[PDB]
């Protein structure tokens, strides 16, 4: 019986947008994103909002602690909270039968959280760990590093609970952060494999903490910074970046491309990348294992592009010139107007592919539903895509060659370069 | 403290038992009888009857088997005694002594030694005045004239009683008429305090601010004097009735007042 | 409803092309796909002269064919956006493809490429000799491969399930470009391969651009038919690889489990479900659902354990494995121990009734995308000769209950010689005696 | 009327444990749950029923008890721990029941 | 198989294995008894008052 | 081992945990007086109950 | 590395019953634990005679 | 703690002395006389108690 749906999606008198789309999938997966985050942090409540993370589980003004998890758990459902620096989603899986049951905890946890101070008290000791699983990649050291050396404030901000604060963040300042964040113009309640009526009925006549924007971000000034941590690893991973595009931005697709002309990440297990060039490049340079690829991040109101490289200690001068000459030789019309050609059918690939995933699906139409109230057709997101000249791409190119440059590196930094030879 | 409460229990019983059978040694009137009257209740018990009780005698009466398997129980039961009375203060250590206000002394405590090492000491020659005044200036205040006369099968005393400590249970015993069911009385007598730990309903855990519950304890002390006094006497009116009301009321109280009042203290408290 | 859309379920369509090869796929309506061939090859397959391989294999399968050189290969997946990628187990090799559904045939014709006409270039075959050699000296310090690899070294000891599937140091330093063709040769055979597919995917344009590429047709009777393999007898006992220095110890242990034809298998996940998994990170803490899970949290047992039920086609392995720290490996064992007799004497209704759902979301989660569809085709048609539907996993599993739990769970597990690896400061978990002690009475 | 009032204020003085100093919530016999509610007690009320059982023990051990001015007032007996015992009492008993289940 | 069986029936289940040791011990008994008893009389035939005892048995 | 003898010796360390180094509440009254006399009454009757035995 | 590591061979101990590596071993396992047992079960009767 | 058998204040004893007490791999035949001591200890004073009750 079940056939083609189409993606509807309202939004209440409050701003409260709600995306639907119902697939038939034998398991439903609904969700509240949010615009909050390490962002909206200041000096005074850094990491709270990674508490707010890890408090998910506590007590709530509906369910208890053992509710929750029991009541979950009890439908085979799940829970989880994923969240950048400026956006956080609070998401539950679970057969289609039991979403009415596993939406209350939902519902619950985002909307009329208790913060009890001793349930606070004893959850913070925990930032200490679920960091220190995070920090077991060196991948995440330099990324924090690096927001840290691109800004002055906003996005400065790590996305880990720093040490110094751990034990310290208050139930006061957990619940101030979400009266002030968790507004209703603020958070969009997608939700794919069920039918929207339903999935309004219950934003609408359940949904409190309400109106507003609370408040607002300041703005993302960018600082140009230099943060090296020596620390003995025998792999060097830097990172070399400038300010980018925002997200929404017509040079966004300007930049996406020029990431994957010069190549970002591999297709083909243990395979060289041969049609990324800043590979290739730097394959030429040194003779060791290394890796390099094309850095892109696309924030509200900024962005980060440049490239990322591990290399062995010794060979980290030579991998990361290596790099930028590939990125020198691209602003000089280094580029084909095929390279330019393969690149827009990688993109599309690659977009297309990241959204089978239940979670990328989700995560896409939330990702819209809330910086914006609609749906980019694919088809319209594919038109903009390759709608991207290969001047668009050289001048990416040039936006880097030429603007304020801030680093990020750690590892055995003895034979590492300085931004300023470069 | 249930465990430290339990092996005081045991200790308790060993210790009776101890006495008992130490009681039997210089062989006179009352070891002898009381020795007798005693064990034969034991036959009363339904089919091994009969049979534990000729077993533990070692023949048909309280005969020279009975002593030498008595002397014999005698000098190890103490052993036994010192034994349980390590575990006893094991558990005990566990969690530390209680106090008289029943709440936590962590924020107060102090080393035993001096502080209780001298009082203990002190406490130790307080008592010892008043027993040795008793062994030296009055040594059979407390025992019976009975037993300065060798045992003698073929007359019974007219007064067969036990010694102060436990005529308590005496009375008891002789409140039911029914062989079996006085000898269960008997036993429930002291087997009755392995259930005060499951009749605690106060919120607290002294009597310290328990008014109600004081009484009720004082009560319970005059009872036991009254069931003292009554199993001293002859089995007759007015004796008889009083002996039962004291049994009666020795029950109710630890069995349904305690726990009653202990609940209706913890309304008075808006708990 | 939950019913319904399980039996809206697009049908999985099959046809055997008469060289013995096997053509299967789910079409859905998305606009990229997946497709790859399954292989019933494997370290089993091997010998002690040739083990490792087919791993040695699977680093050649993408260094270009004979058709098509290496930098060729390469640039022509790349440029279409397609990813390309593959692995090999004991039992089970695959390589597959990810692209848009409109690439579909020009897919199907790069498979038949390489696993029949790989290069195996005797110049990359010297190079992937040292790569080889340095996945192993990093794979030795994943302390939860090293375990499983002991765990299978002890429990089927003396067998060729007792492989690694990396092969040895030696059967890699000397390999030659014979032994690899003689393996491909050998095992990459129509009859044992199955061309799977799921997404935006015509059964019929994928089977048709099959028989033009898997053309390979066979003679003799020989060559249509699938070999069946020594069975491999299973041992109770232990290894132990202690090393103090490292900081935290490695357990597994298992009883020999009844391999993927018996139903009981659905019953022994059910049950896995109730005992579960954790890890430091759970949110649940202390109010996790699972027994053990909870008494982890409650003392500090462990910093992660994992039930499992790895089949095989004549035998397997039903056990679990915990992360500790030396001086709590004792009593994680002994709680983890526990929780296994109380599956076989005392299971509620309750906890099956929740094993239940925990299950169907994770048969259902096992489906979400093309490469994981593909997968479960590649592999259910491999190993019981069909696909079996949502639905029907659905109807079995439903069809668990408490006493059935019992039942089964005593059958496999109760007073039964284990096979334990522990690796690490191990010197507080001891004696397989106790161990075994623990396999009987609640 | 005011019966069960008369009888409260009553016991409360015949209980005498304000003469200590202390407050009812501090007579609590410290089983399971009562220690539970303590963990859950903010820093500053924590110290304070610190101090005054300590100073209750010294009181205790001196065989003394406070001046008459100094005595609690039934009025002003606050109940410090009962609403953090209820809810811990509550939790437990939702666990019991769901654990039955 | 005697084994599979004692196994399956006896030893398995501790409830069985404890009432196997009971049963077993009881059946046991009587028939080690009787058995030495009986060995014993052999190897003392006619020295045993149960032997000689009719020659003065007779009221 | 440790400093004083008092708490390393397997034996003392016993004597020292139970009769001096022991926590003991500041305000337990007389009525805590009687353990200690009821093991010192079991030590004498012990005694004396010997020394009659004897004989 | 780990790769390298092998059981030695335990010919010289196994029971008959186990000693064919390419036999199922569950087949004759409540053959090896009913004799065990069996012995241990009457060793409680020699002891509880 | 998990097991009663190291947390009851008793149990916990007999269990480190009895069960899960550390013993040397290879001790001898030796090593089993006092064991035997003990027990002939157990059984001297049991007999000797039957004894002395005549
Ligand atoms: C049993 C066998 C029967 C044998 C006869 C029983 C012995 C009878 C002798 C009478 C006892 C003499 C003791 C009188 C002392 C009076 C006294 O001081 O009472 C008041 C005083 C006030 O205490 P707090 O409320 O904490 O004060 C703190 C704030 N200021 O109360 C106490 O000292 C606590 C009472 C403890 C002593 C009880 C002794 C009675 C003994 C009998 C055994 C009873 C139990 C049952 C045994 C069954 C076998
Ligand atoms: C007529 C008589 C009938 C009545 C007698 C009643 C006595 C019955 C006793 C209950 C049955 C015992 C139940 C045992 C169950 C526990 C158990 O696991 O077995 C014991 C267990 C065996 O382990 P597994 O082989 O791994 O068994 C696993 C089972 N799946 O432990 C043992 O080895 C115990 C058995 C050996 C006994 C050794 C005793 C040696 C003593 C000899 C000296 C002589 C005795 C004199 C006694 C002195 C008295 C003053
Ligand atoms: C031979 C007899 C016994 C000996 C040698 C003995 C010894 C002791 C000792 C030394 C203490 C610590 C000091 C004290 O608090 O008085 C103690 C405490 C205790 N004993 Fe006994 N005891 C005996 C019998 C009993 C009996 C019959 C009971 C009750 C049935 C009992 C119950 C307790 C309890 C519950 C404590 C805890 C005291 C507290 O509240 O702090 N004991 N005993
Ligand atoms: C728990 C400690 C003990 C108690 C309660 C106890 C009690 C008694 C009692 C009540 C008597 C009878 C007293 C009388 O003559 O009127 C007695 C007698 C006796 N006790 Fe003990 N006794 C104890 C320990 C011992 C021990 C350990 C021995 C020596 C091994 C012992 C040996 C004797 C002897 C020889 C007699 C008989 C002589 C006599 O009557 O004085 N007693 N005991
Ligand atoms: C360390 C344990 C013991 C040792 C080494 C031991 C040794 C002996 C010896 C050498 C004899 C003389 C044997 C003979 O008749 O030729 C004897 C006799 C006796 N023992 Fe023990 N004994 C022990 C424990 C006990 C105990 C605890 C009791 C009972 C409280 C006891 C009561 C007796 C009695 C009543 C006799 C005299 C009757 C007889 O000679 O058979 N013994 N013992
Ligand atoms: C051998 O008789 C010893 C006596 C004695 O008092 O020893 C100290 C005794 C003398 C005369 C009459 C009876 C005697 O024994 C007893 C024994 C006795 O034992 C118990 C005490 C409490 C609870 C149960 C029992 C019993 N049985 N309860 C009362 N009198």
Redesign the pocket.
């Known amino acids: 019986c079940p056939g083609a749906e189409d993606l509807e999606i309202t939004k209440l008198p409050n701003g409260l947008i709600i995306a639907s789309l119902e697939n038939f999938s034998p398991a439903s997966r609904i969700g509240v994103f949010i615009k909050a985050g390490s962002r909206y942090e200041t000096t005074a409540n850094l990491g709270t909002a990674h508490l707010l993370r890890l408090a998910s589980p506590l007590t709530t003004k509906g369910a208890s602690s053992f509710r929750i998890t029991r009541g979950i758990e009890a439908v085979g459902g799940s829970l989880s909270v994923y969240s950048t620096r400026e956006k956080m989603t609070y998401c539950v899986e679970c057969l289609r039968d039991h979403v009415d049951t596993v939406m209350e905890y939902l519902l619950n946890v985002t909307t009329a959280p208790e913060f009890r101070p001793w349930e606070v008290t004893d959850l913070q000791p925990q930032l200490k760990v679920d960091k220190a699983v995070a920090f077991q990649s060196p991948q995440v050291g330099v990324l924090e590093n690096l927001h840290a050396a691109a800004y002055k404030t906003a996005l400065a901000n790590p996305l880990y609970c720093p040490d110094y604060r751990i034990g310290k963040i208050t139930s006061e300042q957990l619940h101030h952060f979400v009266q002030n964040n968790f507004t209703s113009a603020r958070m969009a309640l997608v939700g794919i494999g069920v039918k929207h009526s339903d999935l309004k009925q219950v934003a609408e006549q359940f949904l409190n903490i309400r109106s507003g924007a609370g408040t607002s971000s300041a703005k993302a000034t960018y600082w140009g910074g230099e943060i090296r941590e020596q620390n003995g690893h025998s792999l060097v991973h830097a990172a070399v970046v400038t300010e980018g595009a925002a997200v929404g931005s017509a040079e966004a697709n300007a930049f996406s491309v020029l990431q994957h002309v010069l190549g970002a990440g591999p297709l083909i297990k243990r395979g060289s990348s041969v049609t990324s060039k800043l590979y290739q490049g730097v394959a030429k340079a040194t003779t060791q294992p290394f890796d390099a690829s094309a850095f892109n991040v696309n924030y509200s109101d900024s962005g980060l592009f440049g490239f990322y490289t591990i290399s062995q200690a010794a060979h980290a001068g030579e991998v990361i010139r290596a790099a930028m000459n590939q990125l020198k030789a691209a602003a000089q019309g280094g580029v084909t107007e095929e390279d330019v050609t393969k690149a827009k059918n990688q993109l599309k690939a690659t977009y297309l592919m990241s959204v089978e995933t239940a979670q990328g699906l989700l995560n896409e139409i939330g990702s819209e539903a809330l910086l914006s109230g609609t749906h980019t057709a694919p088809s319209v997101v594919a038109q903009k895509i390759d709608s991207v000249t290969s001047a668009d791409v050289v001048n990416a190119a040039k936006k880097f060659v030429s603007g304020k440059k801030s680093m990020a590196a750690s590892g055995d930094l003895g034979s590492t370069p300085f931004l300023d030879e470069l | 403290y249930k465990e430290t409460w339990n092996t005081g229990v045991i200790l308790l019983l060993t210790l009776?038992a101890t006495?008992?059978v130490g009681?039997?040694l210089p062989w006179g009137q009352?070891?002898f009888?009381?020795?007798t009257?005693?064990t034969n209740?034991f036959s009363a018990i339904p089919y091994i009857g009969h049979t534990l009780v000729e077993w533990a005698w070692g023949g048909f009466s309280v005969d020279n088997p009975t002593l030498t398997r008595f002397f014999a129980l005698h000098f190890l039961l103490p052993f036994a005694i010192a034994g349980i009375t390590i575990i006893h203060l094991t558990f005990l250590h566990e969690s530390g002594s209680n106090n008289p206000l029943g709440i936590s002394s962590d924020s107060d405590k102090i080393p035993f030694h001096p502080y209780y090492s001298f009082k203990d000491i002190l406490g130790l020659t307080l008592m010892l005045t008043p027993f040795l005044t008793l062994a030296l200036f009055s040594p059979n205040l407390l025992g019976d004239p009975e037993n300065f006369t060798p045992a003698n099968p073929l007359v019974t005393p007219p007064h067969?009683?036990?010694?102060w400590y436990?005529l308590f249970?005496?009375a008891i015993?002789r409140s039911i008429p029914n062989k079996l069911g006085g000898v269960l009385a008997?036993?429930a007598?002291?087997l009755i305090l392995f259930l005060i730990p499951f009749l605690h309903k106060s919120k607290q855990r002294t009597m310290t601010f328990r008014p109600l519950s004081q009484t009720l304890f004082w009560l319970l002390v005059a009872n036991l004097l009254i069931l003292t006094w009554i199993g001293s006497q002859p089995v007759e009116h007015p004796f008889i009735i009083i002996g039962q009301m004291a049994s009666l009321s020795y029950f109710t109280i630890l069995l349904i007042l305690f726990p009653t009042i202990g609940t209706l203290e913890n309304k008075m408290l808006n708990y | 409803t939950y019913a319904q859309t399980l039996q809206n379920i697009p049908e999985t369509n099959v046809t055997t092309l008469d060289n013995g090869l096997r053509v299967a796929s789910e079409e859905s309506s998305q606009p990229t796909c997946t497709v790859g061939v399954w292989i019933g090859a494997g370290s089993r397959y091997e010998n002690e002269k040739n083990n490792g391989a087919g791993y040695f294999v699977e680093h050649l399968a993408f260094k270009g064919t004979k058709k098509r050189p290496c930098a060729a290969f390469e640039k022509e997946v790349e440029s279409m956006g397609a990813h390309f990628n593959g692995y090999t187990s004991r039992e089970q090799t695959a390589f597959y493809i990810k692209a848009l559904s409109k690439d579909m045939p020009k897919v199907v014709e790069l498979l038949a490429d390489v696993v029949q006409n790989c290069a195996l270039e005797e110049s990359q075959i010297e190079k992937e000799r040292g790569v080889i050699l340095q996945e192993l000296k990093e794979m030795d310090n994943d302390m939860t491969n090293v375990t499983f690899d002991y765990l299978h070294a002890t429990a089927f000891q003396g067998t060729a399930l007792a492989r690694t599937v990396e092969g040895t140091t030696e059967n890699i330093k000397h390999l030659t470009r014979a032994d690899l063709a003689s393996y491909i040769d050998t095992h990459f055979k129509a009859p044992r391969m199955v061309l799977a597919a799921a997404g935006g995917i015509s059964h019929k344009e994928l089977v048709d651009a099959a028989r033009q590429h898997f053309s390979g047709v066979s003679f003799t009777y020989k060559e249509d038919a699938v070999p069946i393999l020594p069975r491999c007898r299973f041992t109770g006992s232990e290894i132990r690889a202690r090393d103090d220095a490292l900081p935290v110890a490695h357990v597994a242990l298992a009883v020999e489990g009844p391999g993927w034809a018996d139903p009981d298998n659905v019953v022994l996940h059910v049950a896995n479900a109730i005992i579960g998994r954790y890890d430091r990170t759970f949110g649940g803490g202390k109010h996790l659902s699972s027994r053990l899970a909870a008494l982890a949290v409650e003392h500090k047992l462990c910093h992660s354990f994992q039930t499992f039920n790895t089949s095989y086609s004549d035998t397997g392995l039903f056990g679990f494995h915990f992360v500790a720290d030396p001086l709590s490996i004792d009593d994680m064992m002994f709680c983890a121990q526990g929780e296994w007799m109380r599956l076989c004497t005392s299971t509620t209704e309750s906890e099956v009734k929740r094993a239940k759902n925990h299950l169907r979301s994770a048969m259902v989660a096992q489906l979400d995308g093309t490469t994981p569809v593909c997968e479960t085709i590649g592999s259910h048609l491999l190993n019981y000769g069909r696909r079996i539907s949502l639905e029907e996993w659905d109807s079995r599993i439903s069809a668990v209950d408490a006493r059935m739990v019992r039942d089964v769970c005593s059958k496999y597990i109760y007073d039964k010689c284990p096979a334990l690896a522990a690796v690490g400061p191990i010197e507080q978990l001891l004696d397989y005696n106790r161990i075994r002690s623990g396999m009987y009475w609640i | 009327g005011r019966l069960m009032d008369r009888i409260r204020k009553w016991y409360y003085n015949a209980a005498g444990f304000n003469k200590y100093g202390l407050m009812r919530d501090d007579t609590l016999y410290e089983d399971d749950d009562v220690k539970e509610a303590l963990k859950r007690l903010p820093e500053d009320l924590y110290n304070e029923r610190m101090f005054r059982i300590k100073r209750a023990l010294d009181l205790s051990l001196k065989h003394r008890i406070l001046p008459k001015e100094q005595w609690v007032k039934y009025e002003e007996d606050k109940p410090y721990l009962e609403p953090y015992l209820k809810e811990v009492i509550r939790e437990r008993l939702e666990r019991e029941a769901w654990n039955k289940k | 198989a005697l084994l599979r069986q004692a196994y399956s029936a006896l030893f398995r289940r501790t409830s069985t294995f404890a009432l196997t040791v009971v049963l077993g011990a009881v059946l046991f008994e009587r028939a080690f008894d009787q058995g030495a008893d009986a060995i014993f009389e052999h190897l003392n035939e006619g020295k045993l008052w149960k032997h000689i005892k009719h020659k003065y048995e007779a009221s | 081992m440790a400093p004083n003898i008092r708490k390393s010796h397997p034996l003392l360390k016993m004597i020292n945990n139970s009769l001096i180094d022991l926590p003991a509440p500041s305000n337990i009254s007389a009525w805590w007086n009687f353990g200690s006399l009821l093991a010192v009454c079991l030590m004498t009757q012990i005694l004396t109950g010997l020394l009659l035995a004897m004989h | 590395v780990h790769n390298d590591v092998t059981v030695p061979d335990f010919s010289a101990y196994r029971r008959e019953d186990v000693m064919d590596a390419t036999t199922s071993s569950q087949t004759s396992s409540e053959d090896r634990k009913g004799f065990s047992y069996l012995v241990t079960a009457t060793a409680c009767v020699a002891t509880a005679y």
Do not use: T
């Open positions: 009776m006495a008992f009681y039997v009352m070891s009888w009381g020795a009257v005693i209740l067969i009683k036990p010694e436990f249970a005496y015993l008997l036993a007598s002291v």
